[PDB]
Design a protein around this ligand. Structure first.
Ligand SMILES: *[C@@H]1O[C@H](CO)[C@@H](O[C@@H]2O[C@H](CO)[C@@H](O[C@@H]3O[C@H](CO[C@H]4O[C@H](CO[C@H]5O[C@H](CO)[C@@H](O)[C@H](O)[C@@H]5O[C@H]5O[C@H](CO)[C@@H](O)[C@H](O)[C@@H]5O)[C@@H](O)[C@H](O[C@H]5O[C@H](CO)[C@@H](O)[C@H](O)[C@@H]5O)[C@@H]4O)[C@@H](O)[C@H](O[C@H]4O[C@H](CO)[C@@H](O)[C@H](O)[C@@H]4O[C@H]4O[C@H](CO)[C@@H](O)[C@H](O)[C@@H]4O[C@H]4O[C@H](CO)[C@@H](O)[C@H](O)[C@@H]4O)[C@@H]3O)[C@H](O)[C@H]2NC(C)=O)[C@H](O)[C@H]1NC(C)=O
Ligand SMILES: CCCCCCCCCCCCCCCCCC(=O)OC[C@@H](COP(=O)(O)OC[C@@H](N)C(=O)O)OC(=O)CCCCCCCCCCCCCCC
Ligand SMILES: CCCCCCCCCCCCCCCCCCCC(=O)O[C@H](COC(=O)CCCCCCCCCCCCCC)COP(=O)(O)OCCN
Ligand SMILES: CCCCCCCCCCCCCCCCCCCC(=O)O[C@H](COC(=O)CCCCCCCCCCCCCC)COP(=O)(O)OCCN
Ligand SMILES: CCCCCCCCCCCCCCCCCCCC(=O)O[C@H](COC(=O)CCCCCCCCCCCCCC)COP(=O)(O)OCCN
Ligand SMILES: *[C@@H]1O[C@H](CO)[C@@H](O[C@@H]2O[C@H](CO)[C@@H](O)[C@H](O)[C@H]2NC(C)=O)[C@H](O)[C@H]1NC(C)=O
Ligand SMILES: CC(=O)[C@H]1CC[C@H]2[C@@H]3CC=C4C[C@@H](OS(=O)(=O)O)CC[C@]4(C)[C@H]3CC[C@]12C
Lengths: 333, 106, 80, 193, 104
């Protein structure tokens, strides 16, 4: 009817290559979000997936009409005919919009030129996780976006008061972590092209313990007590105790290999490989202890007999001590 | 065949007090339960299409409450012209109505 | 045996029924387990009467290959 | 499976099923690429979600599934149960053969460890304990208890052989009945649901 | 691709500040020692074309390898050596130890 006339009058003499107020003042863009789900935080690639509803609203004095209708509600068929800011996410490894069934976009042009442009995005953002204190580690890693070609003198972004609003936080694929909060931030960065206004949203993730507790800690402590079980078998049965030691060492090295294969290749010492190394040391020390015991039985049975009962008390106490220290320290750190 | 057990069969209540009616479905009916008000010598009139959505022209004292099987029709300040039958009927499958509740004044 | 059955079952999807190769591996595992439990039987009754032990060993030597060949033949005739 | 409109609120575009809502979502007879699960039935529903932009109509469709337990039985529960049996075999061996019982115990503990690891790999990296996890934990406890019992027997051997023979003859009956009772309880309380 | 060296000329802008952001790159396994910027010409059957080259020199870290596969080798060889303290009368213990170490 008459909405066709309005849309035709708005696009007569319109150049979608020139930002609104190209030579007057910067274009103020208000950005809002709606986090559907924060995807899996895989530490191997130092990335995490997020799915949002990115909304941008700005003023365009050229899309200003005067009729009884207050707002024009349009689908994605008129997005490619007006000016649209070139917002890109600076720390996204790979991100893409949605196209099924129709491009997921929305365009609402109000009466005074105010434009609202909303689209659906799935961003595989990047964040370099400091994998110390693993798996007792907490991260807070961002999602940054800015204009690509327009410097600070042309496009200025600005958060709204109630900009970022998370969803239910229950049907998210955050397995090992747990959402605790967020905060928005605005800064200005320097590039070879110019000065850009970079906005950021920090998501706070806390690694919940569990999978690792039952995947590596319990197996290794149970292997350690298995190695302690050798201290009660009589000292005359050599092959039994040697088999104990060597098979325990084999399982210990297999479990250490698996545990380190869990997280990526890092050249520093984490808190999990330290634990498996201490357990390895314990098992190796029990085996060399039995070796010296058997060697001393031929020399002085006195020391070979006293050593067994000494170790029976010295090993579990030293392991309790190690555990206590380790756990308390890391839980406070 | 989905059967709708509507309760109670007939209640008598005075003017101005809150009243509630229940309609329990046998199988699953998501929110496709409708409430009709049939006055004597008249045709049923749709009150609540879907669960908890008043029809155009229905006073705000009628409210629906939906679930998978149990549904409720609550009337607030009950007036003097609300003395009629109240049928509940699902539509998730081929429509089957309830027995209805004869509301009375005393 | 158990590690061959698990590694082989890692190359296929999580199929809920018993394939033919699974049946063969489970028969081979039963034969191995029975051999171990026959050594344990011998070890148990050894001190009380070694004659029955040497006898059981002869009977085992004679009748593990026979039963295994019979199972193998019925298997390769039921599936082929 | 929730689908709605983009850019069109409820005052503009309302969705509705074309047939009776129970007969709208149809599934083909031969259309089942499910090898692990078992599709039971569909269930549709229509609601309205509020938002920051407007009120939208949202159509929902749940496909009810039911996991098939055959593969997990074959590859976790049988190896666990067999390892436990192989562990309890160590009680019928004589007390003079120490290396044999030591090998039994150690190898059964190693087998249970590797079984736990291989059983936890199939699932997502979830932070709570599943039913299979409880079963594997109980089997681990049984094998470890068998090893501890053998160690106690060996400790009392050559000093109080009567007590050693007593606890061995008692553990030849206490472990299998306890494992059977645990199996009955576990399977009964987990198959009724 | 299309234009030979008498149609186009490539050069770095600044010749040492043309490439930035290298010192901030953190790699989990390697370490950027340095980088060079080269400007040359290649000759194909169709003409002589301009070319630039950005050549990093990654040096691999060694800590992870020590902790992952050098230490276990040394400990397995030492576990093999312990078999020398066992007396030669026990033939089921030294065979066990040595054989297991070989397999490992
Ligand atoms: C190296 O070579 C590569 C291969 O050649 C090349 O990649 C190609 O790049 C081009 C350009 O970048 C891509 O073409 C664009 O694609 C945009 C969207 O792309 C998404 O979808 C395509 C598939 O496209 C189908 O689906 C969309 C969504 O439904 C449709 O809109 C398309 O028309 C098309 O539909 C046909 O095909 C469907 C089957 O898929 C059918 O169902 C359908 O019926 C049609 O037959 C995907 O392939 C894309 O994925 C790839 O790209 C992403 C990019 O991020 C990658 O991440 C990803 O990994 C993949 O690689 C992606 O998912 C189109 O929107 C776009 O068309 C619009 O823009 C142009 C330019 O502005 C306009 O001229 C054009 O008219 C369109 O604008 C109209 O429509 C929009 C809708 O949003 C309106 O807003 C707009 O106002 C305008 O409306 C006006 O015109 C309409 C008619 O057009 C009219 O109806 C309106 O009323 C109004 O008047 C363009 O097609 C191409 O897909 C890439 N191909 C591949 C294989 O990657 C690469 O860039 C090269 N590299 C370099 C360095 O050069
Ligand atoms: C001394 C030691 C002696 C050792 C002897 C040798 C010992 C052999 C031990 C075989 C190992 C156990 C076999 C189990 C078994 O047979 O599995 C039964 C059933 C399982 O249930 P499911 O149907 O898979 O569950 C999913 C289902 N609900 C769905 O999803 O549809 O499957 C069947 O019955 C169908 C297949 C039968 C084929 C028989 C081949 C015999 C070949 C020949 C093999 C048997 C020959 C025996 C000869 C001794
Ligand atoms: C040492 C490592 C050894 C590794 C290798 C060992 C392999 C063993 C080989 C020996 C022979 C074993 C015989 C097993 C026969 C085949 C098994 C097929 C299982 C199967 O597919 O059945 C599922 C049923 O599960 C169920 O319903 C299961 C319910 C209960 C499970 C069994 C409980 C055992 C308890 C035993 C107690 C003994 C303790 C006392 C000492 C299918 O089910 P579906 O869902 O796919 O379709 C059907 C609806 N059900
Ligand atoms: C429905 C069942 C539900 C149960 C679920 C979980 C149960 C798991 C463990 C149960 C195993 C069965 C235990 C049956 C043993 C009974 C026979 C014992 C004979 C006996 O009395 O002698 C004792 C022998 O020690 C022994 O028998 C050694 C016992 C070892 C202690 C337990 C070790 C647990 C392992 C923990 C680590 C693994 C955790 C896994 C993550 C020492 O008694 P005495 O010196 O007084 O002799 C004088 C007594 N006439
Ligand atoms: C659900 C699981 C139900 C299974 C119950 C398992 C019960 C174990 C077997 C029952 C036989 C008694 C066990 C027992 O210790 O008595 C032994 C029976 O001897 C014999 O003749 C061996 C009995 C053969 C075991 C029967 C298998 C039943 C399963 C002799 O004991 P002892 O200490 O006097 O022997 C001399 C030391 N070498
Ligand atoms: C998102 O950004 C806005 C704008 O920077 C923050 O809003 C400010 O909040 C502080 C404290 O709550 C107030 O003192 C300011 O007046 C607010 N400014 C505006 C323009 O509203 C908001 O706190 C940020 N959200 C976070 C950090 O979660
Ligand atoms: C104590 C004894 O009297 C001897 C007699 C039989 C021996 C075992 C024969 C084979 C193997 C498998 C080998 O596999 S491995 O992958 O774990 O390295 C590890 C070592 C192990 C368990 C021997 C340990 C020592 C014995 C138990």
């Amino acid at each position: 009817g008459d909405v066709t006339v309005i849309l035709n009058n708005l696009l007569e003499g319109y150049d979608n290559k020139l930002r609104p107020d190209i030579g007057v003042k910067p274009t103020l863009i208000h950005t809002d979000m709606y986090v559907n789900s924060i995807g899996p935080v895989n530490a191997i690639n130092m990335e995490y997936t997020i799915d949002i509803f990115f909304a941008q609203t700005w003023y365009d004095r050229r899309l200003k009409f005067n009729s009884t209708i207050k707002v024009l509600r349009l689908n994605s068929n008129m997005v490619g005919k007006i000016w649209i800011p070139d917002t890109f996410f600076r720390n996204s490894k790979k991100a893409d919009a949605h196209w099924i069934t129709t491009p997921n976009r929305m365009l609402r042009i109000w009466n005074d030129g105010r434009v609202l442009y909303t689209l659906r995005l799935t961003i595989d953002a990047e964040c370099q996780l400091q994998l110390h204190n693993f798996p007792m580690d907490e991260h807070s890693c961002p999602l940054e976006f800015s204009s690509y070609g327009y410097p600070r003198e042309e496009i200025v972004y600005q958060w709204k008061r109630s900009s970022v609003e998370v969803g239910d936080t229950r049907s998210w694929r955050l397995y090992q972590f747990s959402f605790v909060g967020l905060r928005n931030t605005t800064e200005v960065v320097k590039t070879t092209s110019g000065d850009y206004v970079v906005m950021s949203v920090y998501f706070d993730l806390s690694r919940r313990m569990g999978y690792f507790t039952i995947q590596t800690y319990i197996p290794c402590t149970l292997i350690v007590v298995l190695s302690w079980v050798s201290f009660w078998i009589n000292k005359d049965a050599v092959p039994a105790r040697t088999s104990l030691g060597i098979t325990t060492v084999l399982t210990m090295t297999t479990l250490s290999t698996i545990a380190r294969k869990s997280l990526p290749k890092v050249s520093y010492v984490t808190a999990m490989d330290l634990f498996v190394s201490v357990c390895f040391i314990f098992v190796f020390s029990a085996l060399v202890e039995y070796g010296t015991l058997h060697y001393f039985v031929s020399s002085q049975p006195a020391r070979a007999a006293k050593m067994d009962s000494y170790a029976r008390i010295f090993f579990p106490t030293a392991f309790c001590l190690f555990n206590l220290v380790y756990w308390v320290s890391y839980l406070y750190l | 065949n989905i059967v709708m057990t509507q309760s109670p069969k007939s209640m008598s209540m005075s003017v101005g007090e809150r009243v509630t009616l229940s309609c329990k479905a046998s199988e699953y009916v998501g929110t496709y339960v409708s409430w009709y008000q049939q006055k004597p010598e008249q045709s049923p009139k749709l009150l609540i299409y879907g669960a908890s959505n008043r029809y155009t022209g229905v006073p705000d004292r009628f409210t629906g409450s939906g679930s998978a099987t149990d549904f409720t029709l609550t009337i607030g300040s009950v007036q003097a012209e609300d003395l009629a039958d109240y049928h509940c009927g699902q539509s998730y499958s081929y429509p089957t109505f309830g027995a209805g509740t004869k509301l009375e004044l005393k | 045996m158990t590690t061959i059955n698990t590694h082989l079952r890692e190359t296929l999807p999580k199929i809920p029924y018993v394939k033919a190769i699974d049946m063969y591996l489970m028969g081979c595992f039963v034969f191995v387990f029975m051999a171990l439990l026959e050594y344990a039987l011998v070890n148990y009754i050894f001190f009380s009467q070694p004659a029955r032990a040497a006898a059981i060993d002869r009977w085992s030597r004679i009748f593990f290959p026979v039963v295994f060949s019979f199972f193998n033949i019925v298997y390769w005739l039921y599936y082929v | 499976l929730k689908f709605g409109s983009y850019a069109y609120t409820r005052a503009e575009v309302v969705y509705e099923w074309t047939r009776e809502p129970a007969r709208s979502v149809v599934v083909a007879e031969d259309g089942s690429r499910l090898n692990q699960y078992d599709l039971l039935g569909q269930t549709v529903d229509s609601g309205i979600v509020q938002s920051s932009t407007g009120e939208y109509v949202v159509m929902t469709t749940h496909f009810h599934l039911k996991r098939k337990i055959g593969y997990f039985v074959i590859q976790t529960y049988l190896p666990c149960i067999m390892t436990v049996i192989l562990s309890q075999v160590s009680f019928w061996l004589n007390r003079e053969s120490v290396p044999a019982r030591t090998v039994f115990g150690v190898t059964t503990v190693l087998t249970m460890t590797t079984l736990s690891i291989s059983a936890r790999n199939s699932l997502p990296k979830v932070a709570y304990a599943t039913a299979m996890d409880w079963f594997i934990a109980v089997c681990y406890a049984f094998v470890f208890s068998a090893l501890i019992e053998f160690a106690t027997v060996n400790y009392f051997t050559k000093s109080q052989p009567a007590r050693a023979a007593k606890i061995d003859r008692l553990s030849r009956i206490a472990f299998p009945l306890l494992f059977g009772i645990f199996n009955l309880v576990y399977w009964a309380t987990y198959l009724n649901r | 691709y299309g234009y030979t060296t008498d149609d186009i000329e490539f050069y770095w802008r600044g010749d040492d500040n043309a490439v930035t952001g290298v010192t901030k790159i953190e790699l989990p396994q390697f370490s950027i020692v340095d980088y060079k910027l080269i400007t040359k010409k290649v000759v194909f059957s169709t003409g002589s074309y301009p070319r630039l080259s950005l050549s990093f020199k990654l040096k691999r870290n060694i800590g992870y390898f020590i902790l992952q596969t050098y230490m276990p080798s040394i400990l397995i060889t030492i576990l093999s050596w312990v078999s020398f303290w066992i007396n030669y009368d026990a033939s089921a213990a030294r065979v066990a130890l040595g054989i297991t170490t070989v397999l490992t």
